[PDB]
From a paper:
determined the three-dimensional structures of these four agarases. initiated by GH86 or GH16B, which generates NAOS. depolymerized by GH86, and systematically saccharified by the exo-acting GH117B and GH2C enzymes. exo-acting β-d-galactosidases, while GH117A and GH117B are α-1,3-L-neoagarooligosaccharide hydrolases.
AOS by GH117B and GH2C, respectively.
Numbering used by the authors: 32 to 452, 459 to 848
The structure:
């Protein structure tokens, strides 16, 4: 835990940094996890696919003494992730090179260590000079937590257990564990593996003891099976966790221990009926999450994600797709605790590169976009298996995904359909015709089907208890290459129109939405079909990058497709999804000028403005709708409600505007023509009896800054964070969202600025400033505690505008 503290770092290269006699004292001290690229300003001379932030070549360093009892023992240094092309040294000796940015790995450093009490030094060189080597923002550095593990020479390896539960019922659960035991002694050894099982409230619920005899140098696999009675099942509403404590015994003495958290749960994908979790037919209400926040970047700070996931959770989301790479262990541990089903991805591309600046097949070749494709042939198996070795015990995981939108990169695929000679239509070619066009294409060095088979084979060597999936952008062809035949569940990417086609032509293959637009028409298609068990919205939260393209130039730093923004504040699209996914009565009120709106009332009924852009084809980014009620007097306005209520009556200033029914609105958006005047809009709604009310009030000028805080007390553990929300209010404390202000925060006491954020995807801002422009009347400040305990006094200004005062105790 504390091994992650007190590292050194410099953004500069020199060969002599690896030598035994080099001292890095004049480098900057840092705590891991660290992403250096968010200490650099957004530069216009950088690339937009990686969010206009540079990389470069940075080094790390870490000093640690050999323990006073390092005799007949092993020492392993474990990294969860380093982005990327990293080289490792210890005490002047080269440990290795690790190309991929997202796989975990480790090094046996036991023989390299200096005698008891003396100083060892580790060095890491990180080459992110290819700073456009991704379609999204990556970060740069040791961006996830590390471990230094000391064990006995008779020990369980790192990731040395695998807990499975093949039979799960409410009376009993069969809980198996495989324990690997490595004998690094010079001669044979005898012992016992004792695995004890502990429930949520620390009561012992099972034990198994098995003898063994392992020869010198070798590894042995010990299978054990127990029966847990009346188990607490892991579910998204009730995420119960057990603890498996495996102990190596010589005589009756504990030589080594590993603790494996696990959860008891059955999962099943039926092709006719949908998906089943503990025998409940539930829809998957998923969202795609990139690994970056905004101000912290790729750095895995658990409290920053906890808040983001808590907001997604309360919006009715029960699943997360880690797009498009392996996630952090700390993030998986969070999904276990909070209750999310997790699809873990391995790769974004296989044998051939995607275009980093554009998308699809790569067009140009230059240095800064050279990605993992250089290493895939030699490294894919190691990376895939390490990911699975690290993550296969987490109960949250329920799908291994081998690829995202891979069809673009192999010649013949797109042209074997009839589309490109596709979003809203089915292939013009028949099943046999597509198959026949595929025979006629020129043979390349690599085949999508053959590589799909190898990856799926490797995946199943490590785990058969979870389905192999993939995100297929062209199902039609992938149904006939052997790519889909490799998978247990075929994920579709933006192919709602292909749901009936899968069910018509390939009915025994479970199929699902794995990347989808955040709209009702996508969800409509899922709930109308029992055989389509859910969808994953692109995206759950806004992410840096995928900009610098035609209509998304500097200074835009994110697309803005996310349900949440770069802060984690709720957007209109989040509320629309909340209305589709939650059960409690819900009403969110928005509006635009009748001119700026997408909708038109002609003779009562509402329709879409452009018939060539109807509600059935709405894409990723939601319209910039207003939540305020501060228009200019008399302006013609279109009010729109997102809601699960069957009846809503609307009231302007107390005068009724009339009841409207959800049955009428084909696009699932309530709509009212209104003539503006000051006062208030109030919506009252009923859902199968149960009532609810919401309202938007006209305000006066900006009078004050309202500061909210999420926690009024945290620990002095160098990791806990404070989230300070700033909001503009009028004289009577009504919230302002129609004018912006440059706000300056002031903080007394010992703290670390993580940064400031407003959630504007269209503009850049300095994260490490104490000043930030508000967006729709609000901003966010993120602080992190440090070593020092004390009190924090937080206030803010905008020149003449003042704020309430907040106090937070750091215990």
């Amino acid at each position: 835990s504390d091994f992650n503290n007190g590292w050194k770092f410099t953004l500069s290269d020199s060969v002599c940094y690896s030598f035994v006699n080099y001292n890095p004292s004049s480098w900057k001290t840092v705590n891991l996890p660290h992403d250096w690229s968010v200490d650099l300003p957004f530069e216009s001379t950088a690339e937009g696919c990686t969010g206009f932030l540079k990389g470069g070549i940075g080094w790390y360093s870490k000093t640690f003494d050999t323990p006073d009892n390092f005799v007949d023992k092993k020492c392993y240094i474990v990294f969860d992730g380093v982005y990327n092309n990293s080289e490792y040294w210890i005490n002047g000796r080269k440990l290795g090179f690790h190309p991929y940015g997202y796989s975990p790995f480790f090094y046996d450093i036991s023989d390299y260590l200096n005698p008891k009490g003396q100083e060892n030094r580790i060095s890491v060189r990180i080459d992110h000079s290819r700073y456009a080597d991704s379609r999204w923002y990556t970060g740069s550095g040791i961006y996830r937590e590390t471990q230094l593990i000391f064990t006995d020479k008779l020990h369980i390896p790192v990731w040395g257990t695998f807990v499975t539960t093949p039979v799960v019922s409410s009376e009993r659960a069969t809980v198996n564990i495989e324990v690997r035991v490595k004998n690094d002694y010079s001669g044979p050894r005898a012992g016992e593996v004792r695995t004890s099982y502990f429930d949520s409230k620390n009561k012992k619920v099972g034990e198994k003891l098995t003898s063994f005899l392992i020869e010198a140098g070798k590894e042995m696999k010990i299978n054990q099976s127990v029966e847990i009675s009346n188990p607490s099942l892991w579910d998204v509403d009730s995420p119960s966790m057990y603890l498996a404590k495996s102990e190596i015994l010589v005589d009756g003495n504990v030589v080594d221990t590993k603790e494996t958290p696990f959860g008891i749960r059955s999962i099943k994908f039926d092709a006719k009926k949908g998906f089943f979790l503990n025998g409940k037919n539930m829809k998957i209400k998923g969202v795609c999450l990139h690994h970056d926040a905004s101000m912290i970047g790729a750095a895995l700070v658990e409290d920053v994600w906890r808040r983001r996931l808590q907001t997604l959770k309360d919006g009715g989301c029960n699943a997360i797709r880690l797009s498009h790479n392996p996630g952090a262990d700390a993030f998986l541990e969070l999904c276990d605790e909070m209750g999310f089903l997790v699809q873990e991805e391995f790769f974004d591309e296989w044998d051939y590169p995607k275009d980093k600046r554009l998308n699809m097949d790569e067009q140009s070749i230059d240095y800064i976009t050279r990605g993992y494709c250089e290493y895939f042939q030699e490294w894919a198996e190691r990376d895939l298996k390490n990911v699975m070795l690290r993550s296969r015990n987490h109960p949250c995981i329920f799908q291994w995904s081998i690829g995202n939108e891979i069809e673009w990169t192999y010649k013949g695929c797109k042209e074997s359909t009839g589309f490109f000679s596709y979003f809203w239509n089915q292939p013009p070619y028949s099943t046999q015709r597509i198959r026949e066009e595929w025979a006629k294409q020129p043979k390349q060095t690599y085949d999508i089907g053959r590589t799909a088979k190898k990856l799926a084979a490797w995946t199943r060597e490590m785990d058969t208890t979870r389905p192999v999936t993939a995100n297929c952008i062209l199902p039609s062809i992938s149904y006939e290459t052997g790519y889909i035949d490799a998978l247990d569940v075929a994920g579709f990417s933006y192919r709602r129109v292909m749901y009936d086609y899968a069910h018509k032509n390939y009915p025994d293959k479970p199929a699902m939405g794995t990347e989808n637009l955040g709209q009702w028409h996508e969800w409509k298609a899922v709930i109308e079909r029992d055989y389509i068990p859910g969808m994953f919205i692109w995206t759950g939260v806004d992410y840096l990058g995928e900009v610098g393209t035609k209509g998304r130039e500097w200074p835009q730093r994110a697309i803005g497709c996310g349900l949440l923004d770069l802060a984690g504040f709720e957007k209109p699209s989040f509320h629309m999804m909340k209305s589709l996914w939650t059960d409690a009565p819900f009403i969110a009120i928005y509006s635009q000028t009748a001119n700026k709106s997408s909708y038109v009332e002609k003779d009562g009924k509402f329709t879409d403005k452009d018939p060539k852009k109807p509600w059935t084809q709405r894409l990723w980014v939601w319209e910039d709708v207003n939540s305020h009620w501060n228009y200019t007097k008399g302006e013609k306005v279109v009010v729109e409600i997102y809601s699960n209520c069957d009846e809503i009556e609307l009231f302007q200033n107390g005068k009724s505007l009339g009841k409207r029914f959800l049955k009428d609105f084909e696009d699932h958006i309530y709509k009212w023509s209104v003539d503006f005047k000051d006062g208030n809009i109030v919506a009252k709604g009923k859902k199968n009896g149960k009532k609810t009310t919401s309202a938007i009030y006209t305000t006066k000028e900006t009078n004050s800054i309202k500061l909210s805080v999420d926690k009024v007390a945290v620990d002095a553990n160098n990791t806990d964070v404070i989230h300070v929300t700033a909001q503009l209010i009028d004289r009577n404390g009504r919230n302002i969202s129609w004018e912006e202000k440059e706000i300056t925060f002031n903080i007394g006491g010992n703290y670390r600025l993580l940064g400031v954020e407003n959630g504007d995807h269209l503009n850049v801002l300095n994260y490490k400033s104490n000043t930030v422009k508000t967006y729709k009347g609000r901003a966010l400040l993120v602080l992190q505690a440090t070593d020092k305990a004390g009190i924090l006094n937080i206030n803010a200004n905008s020149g003449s505008i003042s704020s309430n005062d907040l106090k937070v105790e750091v215990k």
